[PDB]
Write an enzyme that holds these catalytic residues in place. Sequence first.
Site, PDB file in Angstrom:
ATOM      1  N   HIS A  88       0.811  -1.216   0.000  1.00 26.65           N
ATOM      2  CA  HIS A  88       0.000   0.000   0.000  1.00 26.65           C
ATOM      3  C   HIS A  88       0.846   1.269   0.000  1.00 26.65           C
ATOM      4  N   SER A 128       0.400   0.392  -6.998  1.00 26.57           N
ATOM      5  CA  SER A 128       0.591  -0.669  -7.974  1.00 26.57           C
ATOM      6  C   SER A 128       1.166  -0.110  -9.273  1.00 26.57           C
ATOM      7  N   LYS A 138     -15.021  -4.052 -11.334  1.00 24.37           N
ATOM      8  CA  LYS A 138     -14.214  -4.835 -12.261  1.00 24.37           C
ATOM      9  C   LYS A 138     -13.847  -6.199 -11.688  1.00 24.37           C
ATOM     10  N   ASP A 139     -13.810  -6.329 -10.360  1.00 24.38           N
ATOM     11  CA  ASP A 139     -13.490  -7.604  -9.729  1.00 24.38           C
ATOM     12  C   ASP A 139     -14.681  -8.553  -9.685  1.00 24.38           C
ATOM     13  N   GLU A 151       0.483 -34.340  -6.069  1.00 20.38           N
ATOM     14  CA  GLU A 151      -0.562 -33.704  -6.853  1.00 20.38           C
ATOM     15  C   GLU A 151       0.047 -32.887  -7.992  1.00 20.38           C
TER      16      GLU A 151
HETATM   17  C1  U10 Z   1      -6.833  -3.538  -1.808  1.00 20.57           C
HETATM   18  O1  U10 Z   1      -6.955  -4.687  -0.996  1.00 20.57           O
HETATM   19  C2  U10 Z   1      -8.036  -5.050  -0.523  1.00 20.57           C
HETATM   20  C3  U10 Z   1      -8.421  -6.359  -0.816  1.00 20.57           C
HETATM   21  O2  U10 Z   1      -8.452  -6.748  -1.985  1.00 20.57           O
HETATM   22  C4  U10 Z   1      -9.092  -5.988  -2.988  1.00 20.57           C
HETATM   23  C5  U10 Z   1      -9.025  -7.164   0.145  1.00 20.57           C
HETATM   24  O3  U10 Z   1      -8.947  -8.384   0.011  1.00 20.57           O
HETATM   25  C6  U10 Z   1      -9.305  -6.657   1.407  1.00 20.57           C
HETATM   26  C7  U10 Z   1      -9.434  -7.633   2.555  1.00 20.57           C
HETATM   27  C8  U10 Z   1     -10.870  -7.757   3.012  1.00 20.57           C
HETATM   28  C9  U10 Z   1     -11.251  -8.827   3.943  1.00 20.57           C
HETATM   29  C10 U10 Z   1     -12.341  -9.801   3.600  1.00 20.57           C
HETATM   30  C11 U10 Z   1     -10.535  -8.902   5.271  1.00 20.57           C
HETATM   31  C12 U10 Z   1      -9.897 -10.270   5.488  1.00 20.57           C
HETATM   32  C13 U10 Z   1      -9.118 -10.751   4.282  1.00 20.57           C
HETATM   33  C14 U10 Z   1      -7.671 -11.005   4.373  1.00 20.57           C
HETATM   34  C15 U10 Z   1      -6.727  -9.841   4.424  1.00 20.57           C
HETATM   35  C16 U10 Z   1      -7.113 -12.413   4.394  1.00 20.57           C
HETATM   36  C17 U10 Z   1      -8.176 -13.452   4.748  1.00 20.57           C
HETATM   37  C18 U10 Z   1      -8.588 -13.326   6.197  1.00 20.57           C
HETATM   38  C19 U10 Z   1      -9.463 -14.323   6.832  1.00 20.57           C
HETATM   39  C20 U10 Z   1      -8.900 -15.638   7.279  1.00 20.57           C
HETATM   40  C21 U10 Z   1     -10.925 -14.002   7.043  1.00 20.57           C
HETATM   41  C22 U10 Z   1     -11.308 -14.180   8.508  1.00 20.57           C
HETATM   42  C23 U10 Z   1     -12.106 -15.451   8.688  1.00 20.57           C
HETATM   43  C24 U10 Z   1     -11.999 -16.216   9.939  1.00 20.57           C
HETATM   44  C25 U10 Z   1     -11.208 -15.661  11.087  1.00 20.57           C
HETATM   45  C26 U10 Z   1     -12.680 -17.558  10.072  1.00 20.57           C
HETATM   46  C27 U10 Z   1     -14.156 -17.430   9.714  1.00 20.57           C
HETATM   47  C28 U10 Z   1     -14.948 -18.478  10.462  1.00 20.57           C
HETATM   48  C29 U10 Z   1     -16.418 -18.458  10.442  1.00 20.57           C
HETATM   49  C30 U10 Z   1     -17.141 -17.422   9.633  1.00 20.57           C
HETATM   50  C31 U10 Z   1     -17.204 -19.478  11.232  1.00 20.57           C
HETATM   51  C32 U10 Z   1     -17.599 -20.644  10.333  1.00 20.57           C
HETATM   52  C33 U10 Z   1     -18.957 -21.144  10.763  1.00 20.57           C
HETATM   53  C34 U10 Z   1     -19.099 -22.376  11.555  1.00 20.57           C
HETATM   54  C35 U10 Z   1     -18.141 -23.511  11.361  1.00 20.57           C
HETATM   55  C36 U10 Z   1     -20.220 -22.503  12.558  1.00 20.57           C
HETATM   56  C37 U10 Z   1     -20.781 -21.115  12.844  1.00 20.57           C
HETATM   57  C38 U10 Z   1     -21.547 -21.085  14.147  1.00 20.57           C
HETATM   58  C39 U10 Z   1     -22.977 -21.421  14.216  1.00 20.57           C
HETATM   59  C40 U10 Z   1     -23.963 -20.330  14.520  1.00 20.57           C
HETATM   60  C41 U10 Z   1     -23.452 -22.835  13.959  1.00 20.57           C
HETATM   61  C42 U10 Z   1     -24.781 -23.088  14.665  1.00 20.57           C
HETATM   62  C43 U10 Z   1     -24.549 -23.263  16.148  1.00 20.57           C
HETATM   63  C44 U10 Z   1     -25.647 -23.074  17.106  1.00 20.57           C
HETATM   64  C45 U10 Z   1     -27.065 -23.017  16.618  1.00 20.57           C
HETATM   65  C46 U10 Z   1     -25.327 -22.954  18.578  1.00 20.57           C
HETATM   66  C47 U10 Z   1     -26.287 -22.002  19.287  1.00 20.57           C
HETATM   67  C48 U10 Z   1     -26.058 -20.578  18.836  1.00 20.57           C
HETATM   68  C49 U10 Z   1     -26.239 -19.469  19.784  1.00 20.57           C
HETATM   69  C50 U10 Z   1     -25.716 -19.595  21.184  1.00 20.57           C
HETATM   70  C51 U10 Z   1     -26.942 -18.202  19.360  1.00 20.57           C
HETATM   71  C52 U10 Z   1     -28.404 -18.289  19.785  1.00 20.57           C
HETATM   72  C53 U10 Z   1     -28.975 -16.905  19.985  1.00 20.57           C
HETATM   73  C54 U10 Z   1     -28.824 -16.202  21.269  1.00 20.57           C
HETATM   74  C55 U10 Z   1     -29.230 -14.763  21.385  1.00 20.57           C
HETATM   75  C56 U10 Z   1     -28.265 -16.917  22.465  1.00 20.57           C
HETATM   76  C57 U10 Z   1      -8.951  -5.345   1.696  1.00 20.57           C
HETATM   77  C58 U10 Z   1      -9.231  -4.760   3.051  1.00 20.57           C
HETATM   78  C59 U10 Z   1      -8.336  -4.547   0.740  1.00 20.57           C
HETATM   79  O4  U10 Z   1      -8.300  -3.333   0.935  1.00 20.57           O
HETATM   80  C1  HEM Z   2       2.384 -16.366  -4.104  1.00 23.49           C
HETATM   81  C2  HEM Z   2       3.213 -15.454  -4.621  1.00 23.49           C
HETATM   82  C3  HEM Z   2       2.913 -13.934  -4.603  1.00 23.49           C
HETATM   83  C4  HEM Z   2       3.733 -13.008  -5.106  1.00 23.49           C
HETATM   84  C5  HEM Z   2       5.096 -13.275  -5.780  1.00 23.49           C
HETATM   85  C6  HEM Z   2       3.131 -11.708  -4.913  1.00 23.49           C
HETATM   86  C7  HEM Z   2       3.664 -10.497  -5.297  1.00 23.49           C
HETATM   87  C8  HEM Z   2       2.925  -9.377  -5.601  1.00 23.49           C
HETATM   88  C9  HEM Z   2       3.394  -8.186  -6.279  1.00 23.49           C
HETATM   89  C10 HEM Z   2       4.832  -7.956  -6.790  1.00 23.49           C
HETATM   90  C11 HEM Z   2       2.368  -7.336  -6.380  1.00 23.49           C
HETATM   91  C12 HEM Z   2       2.392  -5.935  -7.027  1.00 23.49           C
HETATM   92  C13 HEM Z   2       2.325  -6.068  -8.544  1.00 23.49           C
HETATM   93  C14 HEM Z   2       2.286  -4.700  -9.167  1.00 23.49           C
HETATM   94  O1  HEM Z   2       2.100  -3.705  -8.421  1.00 23.49           O
HETATM   95  O2  HEM Z   2       2.445  -4.604 -10.412  1.00 23.49           O
HETATM   96  C15 HEM Z   2       1.211  -7.955  -5.768  1.00 23.49           C
HETATM   97  C16 HEM Z   2      -0.049  -7.413  -5.663  1.00 23.49           C
HETATM   98  C17 HEM Z   2      -1.072  -7.909  -4.885  1.00 23.49           C
HETATM   99  N1  HEM Z   2      -1.043  -9.098  -4.184  1.00 23.49           N
HETATM  100 FE1  HEM Z   2       0.432 -10.496  -4.263  1.00 23.49          FE
HETATM  101  N2  HEM Z   2       1.921 -11.895  -4.276  1.00 23.49           N
HETATM  102  C18 HEM Z   2       1.746 -13.250  -4.065  1.00 23.49           C
HETATM  103  C19 HEM Z   2       0.645 -13.809  -3.451  1.00 23.49           C
HETATM  104  C20 HEM Z   2      -0.464 -13.125  -3.004  1.00 23.49           C
HETATM  105  C21 HEM Z   2      -1.496 -13.649  -2.132  1.00 23.49           C
HETATM  106  C22 HEM Z   2      -1.481 -15.092  -1.577  1.00 23.49           C
HETATM  107  C23 HEM Z   2      -2.404 -12.676  -1.930  1.00 23.49           C
HETATM  108  C24 HEM Z   2      -3.706 -12.680  -1.087  1.00 23.49           C
HETATM  109  C25 HEM Z   2      -4.143 -13.712  -0.356  1.00 23.49           C
HETATM  110  C26 HEM Z   2      -1.964 -11.512  -2.670  1.00 23.49           C
HETATM  111  C27 HEM Z   2      -2.612 -10.298  -2.729  1.00 23.49           C
HETATM  112  C28 HEM Z   2      -2.251  -9.240  -3.532  1.00 23.49           C
HETATM  113  C29 HEM Z   2      -3.066  -8.085  -3.848  1.00 23.49           C
HETATM  114  C30 HEM Z   2      -4.497  -7.845  -3.319  1.00 23.49           C
HETATM  115  C31 HEM Z   2      -2.360  -7.286  -4.657  1.00 23.49           C
HETATM  116  C32 HEM Z   2      -2.815  -5.936  -5.255  1.00 23.49           C
HETATM  117  C33 HEM Z   2      -3.885  -6.145  -6.324  1.00 23.49           C
HETATM  118  C34 HEM Z   2      -3.395  -7.086  -7.394  1.00 23.49           C
HETATM  119  O3  HEM Z   2      -2.194  -7.013  -7.760  1.00 23.49           O
HETATM  120  O4  HEM Z   2      -4.206  -7.914  -7.880  1.00 23.49           O
HETATM  121  N3  HEM Z   2      -0.783 -11.820  -3.310  1.00 23.49           N
HETATM  122  N4  HEM Z   2       1.590  -9.199  -5.306  1.00 23.49           N
END
Ligand code: U10
Ligand code: HEM
Lengths: 387, 60, 245, 122, 57, 87, 66
Positions: free
Chosen positions: A202, A206, A228-229, A272
């Site tokens: 950031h 890019s 676009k995405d 794989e």
């Molecule tokens: C320019 O770059 C940009 C991107 O790109 C364009 C982007 O990518 C993003 C990024 C945007 C994001 C989405 C942020 C996160 C993305 C990342 C950077 C990497 C990925 C990150 C993650 C791993 C995401 C986080 C996910 C996690 C932590 C795990 C998720 C888990 C779940 C959702 C749970 C799964 C569900 C299960 C298994 C069960 C759920 C529970 C239940 C409810 C089941 C039922 C149970 C019951 C009924 C029990 C009773 C319930 C109760 C108690 C309630 C009852 C009611 C009452 C009131 C009590 C940004 C910001 C960005 O600027």
């Molecule tokens: C695995 C090897 C990877 C390499 C070598 C890599 C490297 C890079 C580089 C160099 C850029 C900038 C390109 C440019 O500005 O022209 C970029 C952009 C970016 N990377 Fe990666 N990256 C990798 C994996 C990933 C993964 C795993 C994620 C997210 C889970 C990710 C998310 C992004 C995003 C969101 C951008 C900006 C938008 C885009 O380029 O599409 N990258 N990466």
Amino acid sequence: MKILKSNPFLALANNYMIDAPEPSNISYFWNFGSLLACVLVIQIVIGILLACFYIPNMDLAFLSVERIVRDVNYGFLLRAFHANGASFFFIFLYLHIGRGLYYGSYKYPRTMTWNIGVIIFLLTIITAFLGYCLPANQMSFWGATVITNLLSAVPFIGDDLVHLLWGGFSVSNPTLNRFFSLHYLMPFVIAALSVMHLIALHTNGSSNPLGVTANMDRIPMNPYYLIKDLITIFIFLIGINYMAFYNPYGFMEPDCALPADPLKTPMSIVPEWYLLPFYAILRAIPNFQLGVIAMLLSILVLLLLPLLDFSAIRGNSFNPFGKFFFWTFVADFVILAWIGGSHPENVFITIGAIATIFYFSYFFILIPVYTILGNTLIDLNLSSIKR
Amino acid sequence: MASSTIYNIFFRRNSSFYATIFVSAFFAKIGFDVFTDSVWKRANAGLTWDEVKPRFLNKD
Amino acid sequence: GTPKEEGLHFIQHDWPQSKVLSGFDHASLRRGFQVYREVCSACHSLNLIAWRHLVGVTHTADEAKQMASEVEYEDGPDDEGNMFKRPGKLSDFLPPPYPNVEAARASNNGAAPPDLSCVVRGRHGGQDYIYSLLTGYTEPPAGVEVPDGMNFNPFFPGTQIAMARPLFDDAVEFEDGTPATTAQAAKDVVNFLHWASEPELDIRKKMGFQVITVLTILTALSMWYKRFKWTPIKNRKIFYQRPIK
Amino acid sequence: MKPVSLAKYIQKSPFLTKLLLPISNAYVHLSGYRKYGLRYDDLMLEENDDTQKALSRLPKMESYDRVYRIRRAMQLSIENKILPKSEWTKPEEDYHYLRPVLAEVIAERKEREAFDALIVKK
Amino acid sequence: CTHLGCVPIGEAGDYGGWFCPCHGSHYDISGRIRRGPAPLNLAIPAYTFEGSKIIIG
Amino acid sequence: GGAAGGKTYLGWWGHLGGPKQKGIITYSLSPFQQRPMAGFFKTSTQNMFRRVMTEGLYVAIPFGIAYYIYCWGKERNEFLNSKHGRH
Amino acid sequence: PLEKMTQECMDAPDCKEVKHHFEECTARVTKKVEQGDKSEDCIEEFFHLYHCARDCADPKVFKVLV
Ligand SMILES: COC1=C(OC)C(=O)C(C/C=C(/C)CC/C=C(\C)CC/C=C(\C)CC/C=C(\C)CC/C=C(\C)CC/C=C(\C)CC/C=C(/C)CC/C=C(\C)CC/C=C(\C)CCC=C(C)C)=C(C)C1=O
Ligand code: HEM
Ligand SMILES: CCCCCCCCCCCCCCCC(=O)OC[C@H](COP(=O)([O-])OCC[N+](C)(C)C)OC(=O)CCCCCCCCCCCCCCC
Ligand SMILES: CCCCCCCCCCCCCCCC(=O)OC[C@H](COP(=O)([O-])OCC[N+](C)(C)C)OC(=O)CCCCCCCCCCCCCCC
Ligand code: HEC
Ligand code: HEM
Ligand code: FES
């Protein structure tokens, strides 16, 4: 001031999604970051549910998977979606890496981003290898046995790290337990590394296909790049849904629907498809330790790219030699994967040796020579214009 | 009537927009379910257990 | 490797379930189940399918209960230790002919009849390979001899199968009335084994059609909306007024 | 580190230049940066201190013309099209206008670096 | 069996050793392979001798 | 806030860290006044034809060579382990 | 049914060259073995002939198998 610019959490969201200056002419090959993030989110979410019916034990692992497939409500969807998403992850990873390599996105100010991406790729490979060993299939057991033995190449503590990792003398219950725990743990570390990847990227923005600065015509992310995405998201959804609803085991070798028999020796032991080229590289070298070193270097050579690319311009949009050699290298990579897939027969080993030689020559001999030649030719023509 | 009335009804305020979206989704689900049921039933003639019942068990 | 040691490439046919909008042939499924029970229940085990699976697919509930009530199973401890047999229920798996693998090895020379639950999905060719293996028993050509306890079968890797010809002409009496040749019976057995490998085919292929249709419509709408929003940028006009000093 | 080129040793021998003129012509035609109405010196990377300082020492007319050329090129790259064959960068206008300033800056930095490391050899 | 992992029968075969009827191969009295689909010889364990008792492992 | 951050090359809106511009007039219309799907097919077809005729051989040559050696290798490997190949 | 149709396809004009090669096999290999030589096995020609016959015959019979 707007609330989105004042509240710290909303400010964090805004600075990265709502109002972020981006180049105004980035093509459709810049859409794979969001695809990778969505695939990772899908994988984690589906795996959390998949862990609710899996028993991590060598004696009782296959029957648990079969119960998931044919007894739980919509369990086949969960299994097929997890497998096919894990497969599509590597396709999108390769496309991301190719995009980064072709347009020269590794030669400053964004070099930390490249290193973080390389580390993320290594961690993803390790996580996939750990994951595919869980179902205790035949190739799973035999390939785990084959691959885990590579740690014996360490000089001093070799042949002891292997036993420490195995937790015994062969692939048994403790090995499966450890693999399940590590496969559960690692994706969160991968997500944190991806967050650091985004943070590092950031601070400088890019690139653009032309390779020139784009600090003159910038547009905000939304709504111009938030739509676009969506097209790529829906296309990937179509592909994965077809692959999971009409051919779930279409990426899977036929020697994976059998229980692991520790006496039945399979005809061919291969991992794989997404890890096939590295296995092909490993088997090329007649020596043992040299093979492991070469296999590791095949992935660790991406870090040395910035310091051996002597070019006056960035990118390949105006460099014919790079355009030719990049596609030649891609064809060589595909051929390496094909050779790794097949048997190690007479002609195949020679072809694999030639492919490995070319692959290791590309990153050392070809790149500086053709970059320097292009610079020399362009300068020579430009130096004799008015005369 | 014309085209301004349509904008005035649903596409005037976001509250009157999301409700239209949700109702249309609810109806579209039923429509698509009926369509796929009809097409799948037409696809398989003389190939399901309900249409091979008399041949096997009705003779006992 | 050598063509002898890798077998003959299987033949290719067309099955009803291989299309894009077709399920199974349930009459063929029932006939294949009958042939399975009357032929290969003696040695091949299918210990991953319960009696309740066949309910509503190849048999009615009453038929399944009546058929299952004839097999004797072993139940848990009595009031004072002991183990007592049962008349069978609707929640038990099909009986395995042998108690363990070693007994199977002892009975059939040194071989081991593989379990048939997931064999079609685990062989290089599936239905085609299984059908060709079943129908591909021929006398050996001159020059190659088969030792006692082995049979010549080109489709098997190594051309040495440990089986004998399992399906002879008129081995089973079909309830429907079709003649029981070695071609019809093999086809029905292959169909039943394929069903036993993937019992979820019908629901999967029924859901996929609607999923694909909706996703296609959504993609077609997205491709238009992007062009709608990205219009005032793709059609800009830039003029350069030279800044004379 | 820095771009490298054997663009002077070949100039030392006239025969090599005479032999390599057509190949250079074909290569420059194949590069296709002139199809966008650009000049070669525009494509050079500007992210270090040297080029950043050099770009602030150009005449104002050159800076304005470069800005317009870059903006027009990116506007064309938006829609994936090129100018007609009439409005292509002619060879006469495709001269080196940024290299001398960068050379001056590099010479200044090298002189300071040389002064930095010294020794007393009695 | 070094070929496809079956249990051979001893005191048999053409070479007077271990015989595998699973695929019709024979191991010699010395334990090696002579003919049949078995690629390599039989494996040797890392046993140790202690008086009248041998420990395998 | 402050915290005296480092040096970058992006900045933000208002101060994007670019050279000073002068005399660049720009016109654009409204998305509700312009017409999508206008001239899309013609321009897209011309661009695709030009791209195919321009890049072309750059991709055509390596992939073709790779496919040829793939086919030759498969044929030769199948021949050699057959009966007549080993002789 | 399958055996008869496969035999008919074997004697059909569609597959005659592979049949010729298999005949030359049978003659030469039979002479060799009855001489007392066990070194040659042309199972490849049998593979080719059987593949040709099965490809000729299977689609015909498979349609009426109901
Ligand atoms: C320019 O770059 C940009 C991107 O790109 C364009 C982007 O990518 C993003 C990024 C945007 C994001 C989405 C942020 C996160 C993305 C990342 C950077 C990497 C990925 C990150 C993650 C791993 C995401 C986080 C996910 C996690 C932590 C795990 C998720 C888990 C779940 C959702 C749970 C799964 C569900 C299960 C298994 C069960 C759920 C529970 C239940 C409810 C089941 C039922 C149970 C019951 C009924 C029990 C009773 C319930 C109760 C108690 C309630 C009852 C009611 C009452 C009131 C009590 C940004 C910001 C960005 O600027
Ligand atoms: C695995 C090897 C990877 C390499 C070598 C890599 C490297 C890079 C580089 C160099 C850029 C900038 C390109 C440019 O500005 O022209 C970029 C952009 C970016 N990377 Fe990666 N990256 C990798 C994996 C990933 C993964 C795993 C994620 C997210 C889970 C990710 C998310 C992004 C995003 C969101 C951008 C900006 C938008 C885009 O380029 O599409 N990258 N990466
Ligand atoms: C979806 C089913 C129907 C669900 C239907 C029920 C949903 C609940 C309905 C209301 C949801 C929105 C809550 C806030 C409503 C509101 O009036 O906020 C107005 C302001 C607008 O911000 P501003 O006017 O531009 O700046 C103000 C700064 N001053 C001048 C004060 C210094 O504050 C802002 O909005 C700033 C914008 C960013 C902060 C809001 C982000 C989240 C908005 C949605 C929150 C609810 C989401 C619910 C999802 C289940
Ligand atoms: C935050 C993480 C990054 C993002 C992750 C993706 C989040 C996806 C859910 C939110 C998607 C929409 C984001 C908010 C867009 C918005 O501003 O909503 C308001 C628009 C109307 O806004 P307008 O286009 O400017 O038109 C003006 C309308 N007047 C005021 C004249 C009446 O009206 C609409 O846009 C209505 C259509 C969209 C509303 C949601 C309905 C469809 C989705 C249903 C839920 C399924 C999604 C589940 C999976 C996500
Ligand atoms: C004579 C007892 C017996 C009969 C009857 C029998 N099987 Fe077999 N079957 C075996 C044995 C033993 C093997 C193992 C052969 C080998 O490994 O070489 C085997 C192998 C197989 C295999 C595995 C093929 C492979 O390549 O691994 C299949 C599939 C099979 N039989 C199907 C059937 C079908 C269908 C029937 C009913 C028409 C049947 N069998 C009847 C005992 C039998
Ligand atoms: C929180 C995150 C994750 C959890 C809890 C999880 C859990 C699991 C479990 C329980 C299995 C066993 C499948 C079965 O028993 O049938 C599995 C399989 C697998 N996982 Fe994950 N996983 C996660 C993320 C990932 C990621 C990030 C990848 C790849 C990048 C991945 C790749 C795989 C693969 C390839 C398999 C084997 C495919 C198969 O079994 O058919 N998983 N995972
Ligand atoms: S175990 Fe394979 S032939 Fe002996």
